[PDB]
Design an enzyme around this catalytic site. Structure first.
Site, PDB file in Angstrom:
ATOM      1  N   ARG A 136     -19.317 -45.608  -0.763  1.00  0.00           N
ATOM      2  CA  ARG A 136     -18.158 -45.501  -0.353  1.00  0.00           C
ATOM      3  C   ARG A 136     -17.986 -44.302  -1.035  1.00  0.00           C
ATOM      4  O   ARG A 136     -16.329 -44.207  -0.892  1.00  0.00           O
ATOM      5  N   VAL A 137     -17.823 -43.903  -1.971  1.00  0.00           N
ATOM      6  CA  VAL A 137     -17.654 -42.662  -1.975  1.00  0.00           C
ATOM      7  C   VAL A 137     -17.774 -41.241  -1.668  1.00  0.00           C
ATOM      8  O   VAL A 137     -16.777 -40.610  -1.365  1.00  0.00           O
TER       9      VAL A 137
END
Lengths: 504, 464, 49, 47, 50, 350, 49
Positions: free
Chosen positions: A360-361
């Protein structure tokens, strides 16, 4: 009036007695003023945690030497909640969950003492993740990047390489630690829960062979240790880690593995007659993992800009991910590297399922030189996985996609990697450049790894200036691109395939 | 009058009170933790009465360091949260304590989070379509005013951009405000959201409520009701439309199941709480429109194991009226806001509720995109030259329809500097009726990207 | 039950009655709630016997 | 051309089989979990 | 008609008795649908089915 | 001064003691049975202190014919087993008495069954390969001399043939000593092994311990720890390297699951005892070969319902250096020895 | 058990004996009934521990 005066007229530390003991639990009566999770000490020098507080008696789980407990023993209370010593003297030591030295090398120069259960950094104290945690694994750093501050889950079946990926991650940091700059020096904690003693010795020997024992602390709760130690081990690893994080260090935590953490806490909770829920877990098992993991963060500059990166491992039965602990840890964590035993057997080692693992980063953890290369890589591998069935009929396939199939097969070979050989960022960017820019396409598939390794050796020896330029600028400048492609073709003119063909 | 803590077991705490002073259930109680490293004021919610004046409670904070026989003071009300205009542009925990500036908002009016849904006589007797002004939303999947919309997606699928979009849409077009309910949100993602809404300068009109994952399941359950009690005030007293985000309603279900297990209640099918449909109904029914004012909701909803029969999603999908799915395969084409036109669905899309022409045009666009989706394999394997002429003329339209679903949305104004568009419904149902008939096929695909309205298409075509 | 009771008073008078139960699965789920809160043991699909 | 048609048919038939088997595997998953819970909780309530 | 349609969905050609039955069944399925809130009196339902 | 029996339920017995005389955990107690054909002394291990001077115990012999209120004498120590060079070539039950020559061990040094495992300081990883001359084993799952080696497999996939082949291949050539632990194996094959070892000369240096599946849960738990106490003597007190063969190590945790409900611990997932991994770990860690003094362990593990996910197999898999996983799906193709080539694995395969 | 006792009496006397149990699933089900009426907490699949 008279009643209040009678009450006010009616209105040395306390020692409890053991009224019950069995299977690792003791019940202690008395102790009116004990607090939840206070350390209790029993007469044989064994300890207990006072984890349950009934109307009559305290339920205390016992750390380790359970055989020495008898009914009618005196229990003294220590005046403090569970604490562990912390400091720099833990580097290159092996400790049990209480911070006692287990390797026998000598006493630990404990610098300070921290409670196990302090508050995590709240939503105002954090900062956005924007610094790479170089894993040194091509199949991770190019596709599921880990930034220092992320919580990345190494979920896989048994014997699929989870321990090997995390050991590589710890070994890779030596290239940074030899520099004096605290903004680069990642410190590491490996927390072993329910491993056999020789496996912890193997891992210690693997880290010694790499020199990582200069900057890594091992917390050992081996499977022989009572359930109480297995339950505390992740927390003490985090408590040692937080002392460095709050002083503005960078820390990596590996938990190996949170499935035996959850199984120890289930054992303790069922013995205490707490109510069981799904998969026999007590109600709070999500909260048990969450209050562990959410202590990993990147702090803001007002707190010294330190960070902690968590690599929780978990083991999945028969590749299911709908079991209770997997589902909880997948919902808690920021990114999930699925390792599959099928890809492991088909030769893709490490077995990262690049078709289902996500982070998700995303790009915010990668350096610009990696974005400039890896950007199309996920798309190329997705197109290859779609085309894969047509490999049997590649004559009848349109050439414009036959090339995509041949690229994809070379990228899958390019992502393989031998264990204990992490690549620095400046070498993996060049490895991914070979594939993505198509220079590799003239090499036969079975020679790709030998070509890549021979090239990275050649460039390191003769043209280290390309690597210096990449590392010092974090950008693949046009001069370095032109020089690199010139050197790739100069190398191709000297290389030879396993069938003896040229490759130019 | 004060009570004593008598038993402690994990997050669960029992308190004994004097015979005449036993608190009413769902009251908030306060207790102290005095140990130096863990000094807290500990908030308990009353769950059950065990007899003998004993009260079963659950803790909103970790119970570590709590000691038997400490004093418990009843507050004499439910958990209460601040309400008023000065709630906008601040971050609150479930208990109404501010995280951005501690002690802020103590002086505001406080409301009980546990309050009843509207009376039967006050509900609006028919559904009204919400004209949100986004082409893809209005045409393919119309939203219902005071309805609930499910949202699917993730990182690298524009999801936070769509949130900033919808917040701007409600603030500017309807003069309303938004509330965001972080039901079990990641503290990192909560800070990334807080900084993103601050950098967009939309936070001035949004109230944020976070129930972080770090805290026990009592808080991860009550946060959704807290946020809904702020929204209820804005609907009823300020007379504004309100847009309520929930992220993620599966964690509201899960937190409820865990509290029920800590209370020792026997678990039902696949282990949820036995009250599940009422536990959820007492939230979802409370989101509605009354007296001409409305609380619209967007809800991100996780599905365990992807099966829409599991009681958690099977319960949740009984309530909601629309379903927007975001697709990485659409986002990677450059189509923003990346709403998948085939996988998304809506239940208001009927000839009785929207005009017959709207329903016809939506069925035609779905047919054309479905044909193109069925041809995409032949295109990828064999190339366009393997097609006939009759279907290649269809694909020539499908490419343009797929592009024309994209919009220059107001969230992009931070970067592009160009303003965002708001197409009327009566424009977009003409534009897609013309576009399906192929009148614009002589234009290139670049003329339809990010375009907004049909007059803008006329401008961009003459610019190119 | 109350729906049927309102109906039966007309039925036994010799009127004709129509009953629509919308929907009888959610009554089964409510009875599952009331039974499990009473701590009666569940049968199949967690429903009481 | 007949091979194309018969293979499109076979693909549709496999897609409907994966659907039906998935719907069985989910009912089995749920039943298995509910049985495991009923057995644990019955064990606890016996004590 | 429903089992015949399931069979014939991939039949390149068929007997005339199948084709006539298939067309009748398609017209009867088309006959039976109706819009919402449109109750037909039985005196009309009989003629619609005739 | 001695205790008395209060309650009896199947294998579990509750005993009361005078106020001061309450025995420590894991003491062996004795009780008497007086009826006719069932007349025996009964050995009885302390499991829990229930409070108010009550103690809950687990019976080693079947409790049939015990009567409430009979006297119970505390022996003051744990179950003890005879150890020494003279143990090789005789067959012992769990409690350390010789089945083919009653009374034989009474004058030996005796050791407590229970002890803590060796400290982490004394362990080194083992990396000398062991050759066995089996194609699939030497190829895909290479064994480790001094490691912990296992066979896995469903009911009836021939584990008890393959382990007897491993005895025939290794312990024949092996110059040290060996121990065999019949933990809940079927008695017939225990006798086939005893006569086989006597038809060769191997029995002269092989000690045997048996707690076969006819006996009640007390012995099926303790017999593994008893044979292991014989092996730990040979490792530590003599240094002579030793082969420990265990069949079947699942029956240990199963017998724990069988008593656990009567002891009064709430059942965990699929009805195993909640202590499982901590209970089994306290056995498995003892088998380790501390530096300079090798133990080679070969233990067969049963998998219930062929379910390789099941808590017992899934817990056991962490403790092992080479796993030869047998599968019924390969056995049904007639392939013998029926090892699964893909699931089987080894750490020494570097 | 009585079948095995009748059998053993000939077995130890040097006779050859064949026992058929038809069938042990019904014996397991009877032992389950007996244990649950005596209120032992059952193990897996509701069988006695």
């Amino acid at each position: 009036x008279x009643x209040x005066x009678x009450x006010x007229x009616x209105x040395r530390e306390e020692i409890g007695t053991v009224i019950d003991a069995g299977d690792g639990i003791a019940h202690v009566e008395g102790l009116p003023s004990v607090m939840t999770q206070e350390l209790l000490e029993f007469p044989g020098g064994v300890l207990g945690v006072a984890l349950n507080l009934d109307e009559h008696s305290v339920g205390a789980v016992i750390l380790g030497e359970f055989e020495k407990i008898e009914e009618g023993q005196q229990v003294k209370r220590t005046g403090e909640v569970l604490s562990v010593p912390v400091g720099d003297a833990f580097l290159g030591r092996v400790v049990n969950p209480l911070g006692q030295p287990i390797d026998g090398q000598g006493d630990i120069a404990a610098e300070t003492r921290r409670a196990l259960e302090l508050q995590a950094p709240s939503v105002v104290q954090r900062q956005s993740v924007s610094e790479p945690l170089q894993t040194g694994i091509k199949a991770i750093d190019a596709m599921t990047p880990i930034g220092r501050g992320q919580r990345q889950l190494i979920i896989g079946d048994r014997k699929t390489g989870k321990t090997a990926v995390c050991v590589d991650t710890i070994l890779n940091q030596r290239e940074a630690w030899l520099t004096g700059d605290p903004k680069q020096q990642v410190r590491c904690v490996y927390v072993a829960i329910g491993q056999k003693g020789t496996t912890i010795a193997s891992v210690k020997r693997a880290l010694e062979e790499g020199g990582a024992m200069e900057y890594t602390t091992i917390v050992a709760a081996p499977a022989s240790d009572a359930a109480g130690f297995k339950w505390l081990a992740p927390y003490t690893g985090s408590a040692i880690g937080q002392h460095w994080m709050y002083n503005g260090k960078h820390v990596l935590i590996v938990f190996d593995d949170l499935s035996k953490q959850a199984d120890a806490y289930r054992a303790i909770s069922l013995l205490l007659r707490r109510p069981p829920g799904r998969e026999a877990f007590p109600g709070d098992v999500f909260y048990l993992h969450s209050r562990l993991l959410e202590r990993c963060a990147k702090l803001s500059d007002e707190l010294g800009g330190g960070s902690m990166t968590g690599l929780p491992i978990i083991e999945t039965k028969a590749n299911d991910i709908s079991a209770f602990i997997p589902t909880n840890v997948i919902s808690i964590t920021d990114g999930q590297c699925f390792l599959e035993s099928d890809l492991f057997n088909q030769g893709v080692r490490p077995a990262i399922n690049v078709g289902v693992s996500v982070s998700r980063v995303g790009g915010a953890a990668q350096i610009k030189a990696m974005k400039e290369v890896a950007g199309s890589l996920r798309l190329d591998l997705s197109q290859y996985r779609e085309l894969e069935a047509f490999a049997a009929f590649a004559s009848d396939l349109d050439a414009a996609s036959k090339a995509q199939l041949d690229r994809g097969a070379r990228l899958v070979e390019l992502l393989k990697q031998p264990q204990y050989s992490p690549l620095a960022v400046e070498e993996q960017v060049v490895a991914i450049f070979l594939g993505t820019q198509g220079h590799l396409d003239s090499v036969p598939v079975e020679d790709v790894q030998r070509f890549e390794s021979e090239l990275l050796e050649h460039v390191k020896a003769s043209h280290s200036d390309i690597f210096d330029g990449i590392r010092e600028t974090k950008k693949l400048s046009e001069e370095a691109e032109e020089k690199l492609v010139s050197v790739i073709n100069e190398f191709k003119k000297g290389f030879q395939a396993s069938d003896g063909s040229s490759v130019v | 009058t004060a009570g004593r803590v008598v038993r402690i077991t994990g997050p669960v705490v029992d308190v004994e009170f004097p015979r005449g002073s036993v608190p009413e259930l769902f009251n908030a109680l306060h207790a102290e933790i005095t140990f130096g490293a863990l000094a807290k004021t500990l908030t308990l919610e009353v769950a059950q009465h065990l007899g003998d004046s004993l009260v079963r409670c659950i803790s909103m904070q970790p119970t570590d360091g709590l000691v038997r026989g400490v004093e418990v003071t009843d507050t004499g009300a439910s958990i209460s949260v601040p309400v008023g205009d000065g709630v906008k542009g601040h971050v609150f925990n479930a208990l109404g304590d501010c995280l951005d500036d501690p002690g802020y908002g103590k002086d505001f009016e406080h409301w009980s989070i546990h309050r009843k849904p509207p009376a039967f006589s006050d509900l609006e007797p028919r559904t009204e379509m919400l004209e949100t002004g986004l082409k893809v939303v209005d045409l393919l999947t119309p939203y219902v005013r005071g309805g609930k919309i499910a949202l699917f997606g993730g990182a690298g699928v524009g999801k936070t951009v769509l949130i900033q979009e919808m917040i701007n849409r409600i603030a500017r077009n309807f003069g309303g405000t938004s509330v965001f309910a972080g039901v079990g949100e990641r503290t990192r993602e909560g800070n990334d959201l807080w900084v993103e809404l601050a950098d967009a300068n939309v936070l001035k009109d949004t109230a944020l409520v976070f129930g972080q994952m770090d805290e026990p399941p009592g808080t991860r359950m009550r946060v959704a009701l807290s946020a809904l009690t702020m929204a209820e005030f804005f609907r009823d007293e300020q007379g504004q439309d309100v847009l309520l985000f929930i992220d993620n309603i599966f964690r509201f279900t899960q937190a409820g199941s865990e509290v029920s297990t800590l209370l020792g209640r026997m678990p039902s099918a696949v282990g949820y709480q036995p009250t599940l449909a009422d536990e959820m109904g007492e939230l979802q029914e409370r989101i509605t429109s009354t007296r001409g004012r409305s609380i619209t909701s967007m809800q991100a909803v996780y599905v365990p194991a992807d099966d829409y029969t599991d009681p958690a999603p099977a319960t949740t999908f009984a309530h909601l009226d629309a379903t927007t799915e975001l697709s990485r395969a659409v986002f990677s084409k450059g189509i923003f806001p990346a709403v998948d036109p085939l996988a998304s669905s809506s239940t208001i899309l009927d000839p009785a509720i929207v005009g017959d022409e709207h329903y016809r045009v939506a069925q035609e666009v779905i047919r054309i995109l479905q044909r193109y989706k069925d041809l995409q394999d032949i295109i990828a394997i064999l190339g366009i030259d393997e097609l006939s002429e009759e279907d290649k003329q269809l694909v020539n339209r499908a490419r343009r329809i797929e592009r024309f679903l994209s919009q220059n949305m107001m969230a992009a104004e931070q970067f592009t500097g160009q303003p965002g568009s708001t197409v009327p419904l009566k424009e977009t149902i003409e534009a897609f009726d013309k576009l399906t008939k192929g009148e614009f096929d002589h234009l290139p695909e670049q003329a339809f990207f990010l375009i907004g309205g049909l007059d803008d298409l006329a401008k961009k075509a003459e610019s190119l | 039950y109350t729906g049927s009771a309102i109906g039966q008073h007309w039925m036994y008078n010799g009127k004709h009655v129509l009953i629509v139960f919308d929907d009888l699965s959610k009554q089964a789920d409510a009875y599952r709630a009331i039974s499990l809160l009473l701590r009666r043991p569940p049968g199949r699909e967690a429903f009481p016997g | 051309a007949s091979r194309r048609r018969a293979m499109k048919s076979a693909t549709d038939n496999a897609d409907d089989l994966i659907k039906a088997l998935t719907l069985a595997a989910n009912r089995e998953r749920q039943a298995q979990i509910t049985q495991e819970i009923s057995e644990i909780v019955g064990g606890a309530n016996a004590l | 008609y429903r089992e015949l349609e399931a069979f014939a969905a991939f039949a390149s050609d068929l007997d005339a008795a199948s084709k006539a039955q298939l067309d009748r069944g398609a017209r009867l399925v088309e006959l039976l649908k109706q819009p919402q809130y449109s109750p037909l009196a039985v005196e009309e339902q009989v003629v619609a089915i005739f």
